[PDB]
Design a protein around this ligand. Structure first.
Ligand SMILES: CN(Cc1ccccc1)c1nc(Cl)nc2c1ncn2CCCCCOP(=O)(O)CP(=O)(O)O
Ligand SMILES: CN(Cc1ccccc1)c1nc(Cl)nc2c1ncn2CCCCCOP(=O)(O)CP(=O)(O)O
Ligand SMILES: [Cl-]
Ligand SMILES: [Zn+2]
Ligand SMILES: [Zn+2]
Ligand SMILES: [Zn+2]
Lengths: 520, 520
């Protein structure tokens, strides 16, 4: 009995087909992804394979003006259209609180939305009861397949789930649910959740009874063979984990932004043991046509969004690289633009200026902006780069705290983690061959108590004013040292307004990669 | 017989009283220098001393909006008013060619303008004949004093003297002219010229018959005792050189910008032998009042400058370092500002293969003639930074030509030479421990045929477009390889206009030293 699993994760409001960098589609002849194109491939596989399951491993929320306007009603509508078989809750599904999850998604989804390690308490327990389930038994042909859900344990730190939701250990909470499925003589069990590739591998190893793990959160790209686009594989597809009880357990993930459709075929035996498994994510490129019914429906929702593009804020003559593969691994000119804007909004009278430095987590830059659209930069383009609606605050940090933040910036370098810092008024050099915690070899900063601004070595006993996102001021992305050691905090202007005012002032921008970040 | 010599040098259009940094006078109670104040002190000394000579050692041309506008007619007018007894030609008296020297100055000066080592040839020899002289015999009391002139031998590389003027050795060309004076039984001879303190010391040593040397060009400050202002003496005043024939020969110089008045008393005997000499430059500070006749005449020439040169273009919150000690030895933020303006003026859409058609800039540090203090930016403040009225041209250069230009930039590093290049869109690293001609160790340039601008190693076989002053495009400052090897030359907008339009767009500027020029 062969099962075909189709899976998506971290789609992030990429409902319309996108460019190859996951930004707004301009040259439609080379655009990719989108629900319309996804519908075609999904309906293609359903007519070829008898047993098909379409799953989503979380983080459909947040990413473009689609979620800004419809706040999740677009997710429920178009996930229903594609006839998804199950969904796991991600951390971003809570960005608008529990109420932002219950009303638009949990109450309007025609498919089960799962999470086994989320426990509701107090007044919410009655309201959110049964709107999400720890597992679901799905009939597939004349067989049944069990799907247990899990959501990041650290979700209270990543989103806004509230005080009345308890997020338990994934493994601790999954084992009882898998055992209850086995008492129901469900011998085929998929672990579908949103905790990251590293937690997916522990669930495959530690949780007895899970045959497959379908994950997300880490934007992991797995491929066996020659990859078809720019994403570099982090491992074979499927990534095989050997469990504690000796069974080979495939672990899968399909990058992000709906660019690929995960595709895995499992051959089970009569008792639900995995005989073999093979597959590879399917690049949803121009060769696959967009479904016209889904596309027409998309275009009827699109005109409510078109008022976020009428005004031109300015022009860019260069590609504004806001891609994770860039801003999370090295200096990206999108980060330099934002940090240049943050410092420019903070031009006050004290020496030469009160602030000279800026830091910005690469994980806070959520999209690039294309320059082939006549160079036009609209509020919409910016809305996808800075979709959270946070502020760019002013902070005071001892040099010691700043060095610790930059050590953290690359303490686990290589995993596309979002704590890699883009900077302004700072020249940092890393030596990755050195130990974690000892990788910053040079850290020069732009002086304030000086008549001519120049770069001087950071001194740990000194105190520096830095402009950073409020998300970092609150210890987000693991920067707890900023929250615990900062000596002063003042709240600033909205992020997208700071970047928008600057673009309007400069009229034409051309930020470059200048060497603010170097590697030894 | 005691002679009192009053001497000025490298005034550079400092006709009006200035701040203590020789910039625009703002707080008039604390201003210094100026022609009016000089007239008072010179008159005071002539009313006290019997034998007085007022001499200038060159470089009255070029420095402020006074010369940019009046092109030397202000020099002739007020040098006559002050009753200068002689002037030596400097290298900057040729910045506007011979025509720019003959028309306003040589043609309107009521005093002798001297230079013994400038020889005219071919068609010019008759045209400029007698308009400048190798020597002059002047009555001083009931005695007669001879004055031989000399001009920097390297003036063809520093200015625009043309092809029909030969600059001979000061010593080689001076010895016959001094021999000419003693056969006329003139036993008192002053060597008044513009070649630098180091050459002045050779003329005192090598040319027999010279009793005193009055120099310029090196802005050398000499003082005996505690100096009265910020300038640090480079030696006693007078600096005594022992000639090859055993005579003690005083050498004098008086800084620059009309801040000081040189003052030297020489006691001769009946045979023209120097018995002794003493003195010290007189600081022309608020304590000396401005002469009312020269001052009123100054205010009547000011009306052509104040009605067009007093507009505010913008603000700077940082000190704009255009000082020679910085811009000729290391990256200086005034140079970065100018190059950033040059690049911003050349931001035209040419082809869809470029972020912009040109990305790079080079600028001879010796072309940056003043700083701007941040303690309002007007067209006049800028006029002192860029007083030549040149253009910022676009040139095509093979990488080899660019590498040779950057090798030349530091081939004689350490003598405050003006060929040291300020850059934009270029990251150059020098290793001065290496041989001259092999000191550039890294030379990265900003890409043009690229969607995201980034720095890549310079290719000697490729061709790059560079924006540079017209002075460099024509082989000035020894940049022969640029003129000889450039593959294309187009004239651009005026220097001060480009730097001015840029400041107006930015409203507030704050250039920094970013690492464009580094030393290994
Ligand atoms: C909604 N808001 C406002 C606010 C105000 C005050 C305090 C906290 C928040 C937010 N503002 C900002 Cl500025 N960053 C936020 C954020 N809410 C979340 N973040 C971080 C996401 C970065 C990526 C993490 O991980 P990642 O990108 O590696 C994986 P995932 O696929 O996203 O799970
Ligand atoms: C008006 N024009 C156009 C042009 C074109 C072709 C030929 C001559 C002029 C000029 N444009 C520019 Cl861009 N630089 C100029 C310049 N004319 C002269 N320069 C260089 C000055 C170097 C100074 C060395 O001397 P220095 O700075 O070491 C100290 P001193 O003041 O001599 O004591
Ligand atoms: Cl007089
Ligand atoms: Zn997530
Ligand atoms: Zn001079
Ligand atoms: Zn000179």
């Amino acid at each position: 009995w062969e099962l075909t699993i189709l899976h998506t994760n971290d789609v992030h409001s990429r409902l319309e087909q996108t460019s190859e960098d996951s930004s707004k589609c301009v040259d439609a002849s080379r655009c990719m992804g989108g629900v319309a194109r996804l519908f075609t491939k999904v309906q293609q596989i359903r007519r070829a394979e008898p047993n098909v399951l379409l799953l989503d491993a979380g983080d459909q929320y947040q990413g473009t003006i689609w979620f800004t306007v419809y706040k999740g009603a677009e997710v429920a509508h178009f996930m229903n259209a594609l006839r998804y078989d199950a969904m796991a809750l991600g951390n971003h599904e809570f960005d608008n609180g529990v109420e932002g999850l219950i009303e638009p998604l949990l109450k309007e989804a025609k498919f089960p939305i799962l999470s086994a390690n989320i426990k509701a308490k107090g007044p919410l327990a009655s309201q959110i009861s049964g709107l999400y389930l720890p597992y679901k038994v799905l009939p597939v042909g004349d067989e049944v397949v069990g799907i247990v859900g899990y959501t990041s344990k650290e979700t209270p730190f990543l989103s806004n789930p509230g005080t009345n939701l308890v997020f338990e250990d994934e493994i601790t909470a999954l084992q009882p649910e898998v055992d209850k499925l086995k008492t129901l003589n469900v011998n085929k069990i998929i672990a579908l959740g949103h905790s990251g590739f590293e937690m997916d591998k522990l669930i495959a190893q530690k949780v007895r009874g899970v045959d497959v793990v379908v994950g997300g959160h880490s934007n992991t790209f797995l491929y066996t063979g020659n990859p078809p686009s720019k994403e570099v594989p982090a491992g074979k597809y499927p990534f095989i984990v050997t469990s504690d009880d000796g069974r080979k357990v495939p672990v899968v993930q399909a990058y992000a932004f709906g660019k690929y459709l995960g595709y895995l075929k499992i051959e089970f035996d009569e008792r639900g043991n995995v005989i073999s498994s093979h597959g590879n994510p399917i690049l949803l490129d121009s060769s696959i046509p967009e479904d016209p019914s889904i596309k027409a429906d998309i275009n009827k929702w699109r005109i409510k969004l078109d008022d976020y593009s009428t005004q031109e804020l300015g022009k860019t003559i260069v590609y504004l690289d806001g891609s994770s593969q860039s801003c999370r691994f090295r200096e990206c000119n999108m980060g330099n633009l934002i940090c240049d804007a943050m410092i420019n909004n903070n031009l006050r009278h004290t020496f030469w200026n009160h602030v000279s430095m800026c830091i910005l987590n690469g994980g806070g830059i959520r999209s690039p902006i294309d320059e082939r659209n006549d160079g036009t930069i609209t509020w919409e383009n910016l809305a996808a780069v800075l979709p959270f609606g946070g502020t760019f605050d002013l902070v005071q940090l001892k040099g010691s705290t700043l060095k610790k933040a930059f050590e953290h910036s690359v303490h686990r370098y290589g995993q596309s983690t979002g704590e890699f810092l883009q900077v302004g008024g700072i020249h940092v050099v890393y030596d990755l061959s050195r130990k974690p915690g000892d990788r910053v070899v040079k850290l020069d900063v732009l002086c304030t108590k000086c008549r001519v601004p120049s770069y001087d070595p950071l001194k740990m006993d000194e105190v520096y004013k830095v402009i950073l996102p409020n998300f970092l001021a609150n210890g987000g992305d693991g920067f707890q040292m900023i929250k615990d050691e900062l000596l002063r905090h003042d709240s600033g202007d909205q992020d997208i307004n700071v970047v928008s005012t600057y673009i309007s002032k400069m009229k034409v921008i051309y930020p470059a990669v200048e060497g603010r970040i170097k590697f030894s």
